[PDB]
Amino acid sequence: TTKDVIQKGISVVGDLLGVVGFPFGGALVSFYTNFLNTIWPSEDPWKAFMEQVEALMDQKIADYAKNKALAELQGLQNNVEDYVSALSSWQKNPVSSRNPHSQGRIRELFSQAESHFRNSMPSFAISGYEVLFLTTYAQAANTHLFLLKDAQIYGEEWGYEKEDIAEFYKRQLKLTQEYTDHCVKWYNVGLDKLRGSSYESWVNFNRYRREMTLTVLDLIALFPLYDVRLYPKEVKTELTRDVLTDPIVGVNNLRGYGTTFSNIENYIRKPHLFDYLHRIQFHTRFQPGYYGNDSFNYWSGNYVSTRPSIGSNDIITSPFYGNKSSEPVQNLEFNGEKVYRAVANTNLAVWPSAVYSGVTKVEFSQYNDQTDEASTQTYDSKRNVGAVSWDSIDQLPPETTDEPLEKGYSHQLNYVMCFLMQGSRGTIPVLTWTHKSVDFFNMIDSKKITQLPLVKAYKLQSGASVVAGPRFTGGDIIQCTENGSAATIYVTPDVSYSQKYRARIHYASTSQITFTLSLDGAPFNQYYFDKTINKGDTLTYNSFNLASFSTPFELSGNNLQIGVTGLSAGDKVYIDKIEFIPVN
């Protein structure tokens, strides 16, 4: 269920990834038409977003609050549609038909929509219903901000006063901070409300966390890229966060045998440098049926191996998860394959006073981007397989239903972990996924502004570590506590000739610091950076600063090293991303 809103959520993010930064006119209009068909066609999507959170929270919005929200949304739809049709005409029509009379038409349509948004927003944030209105608020907030940036692109063409364009910009800055902070605050409120002790508590908790990531958190991560003044070119970026699909189980009710909340939550992957699925070792066990005829084999445990980010080749192998094999081990290798789907079979044996169930078969769909070919690899228990009961596509739909899956998928497999049920009743497998936008090569685009997340480094040093992200950056961050080197990231230049770049850094610091940049161990850039926070402070939107390095440089190597100095006892520096600006 709810796959509809999940798909809409996934698609919007996927489309926006193509019109982020300063977009070209044709691309902007194309986006807008899909946008209107997806998010703004009727009241149906809005109603579905409200029901989505009500389902996750097991609470309902007061009818009066639900109705007013829907009323505001009908009005906002008209404003958006009227605006888009006019914008479309403007782009299409030559720089001749632009008379003062048509300029005023577009100016008032724009002013109306923008104003209606500021006025309506509080309706999606009524006291006591903040969490329940989260996906609705996130989608409305996104529209408002996306709409706003248009004033910086077409402002002068439309004949707006310098004062008007400026007022719009300040308004965009204030709202980007507010809307972001609002979403993170209530996201967390909801998350804590779902913490429990049972296995059933954890499934709910994790479903909320995954669904809120796809529909809210991924979206707010794009907001800063709507600043076409700071980002006067197209932006190449990616989402580095993990999402965990629902556990694969044969029965709807485990009658108390499900792994406890703590035994799952405390053992799932902790903030780590980015990596890729490399290998899986399947362990199988025999489950006897009370009458022999009803027996079956099942996936009991596993090993997982991942390869790090480009620049390092040493394979990381996981501890053993679950139970040792009673049957012959099965190994699947993924070197240079992208797992875009996983479909599973489960089976059960009913005993006089017990039920035993397990995952008997798993079919993995893989795509080879090098040899441009799809194929499948499967795990088979080999004894009484049963039927398919779990499909990843239901939880992680494709970005587009237009293209074939191997082209339009939204996520790929990163991790596999087996949990043991209480009292030796079986094994629960849990799968971790990563977003399709992640570029393995860490490629620096010669025409765009490239955002490089620090978690794409292959080596941390001087006691630098991966820490949980503040929920609005699309992934995790790097914490620096000592003076010295911090991270080494491998970079792939897209051009051969001596193209020059400017670097910008998105960070947070308790003190004034010095950042140093090196290529293949040779320093080339060193600069002074401001303090952004006080010791102890929690990280909100304003905690981060985006600052340039003075001097331009060429990519005469691949190994980029970031180093920090100027720290004192108790000082901390958080690094999110490094950006490259193609310059002449």
Swiss-Prot record:
- Family matches, as InterPro entries: Galactose-bd-like_sf, Pest_crys, Pest_crys_dom-III, Pest_crys_dom_I, Pest_crys_N_sf, Pest_cryst_cen_dom_sf, Pest_cryst_dom_II
What other comment is given for this protein? Toxic segment of the protein is located in the N-terminus.
Q: In its UniProt entry, what is this protein called?
A: Pesticidal crystal protein Cry3Aa
Gene3D superfamilies with a match to the protein in the record? Galactose-binding domain-like, Pesticidal crystal protein, central domain, Pesticidal crystal protein, N-terminal domain
**Which BP terms in the Gene Ontology apply to this protein?**
sporulation resulting in formation of a cellular spore; symbiont-mediated killing of host cell
Does the keyword field hold ATP-binding? no
What's one Pfam family here?
Endotoxin_C
Ribonucleoprotein in keyword set? no
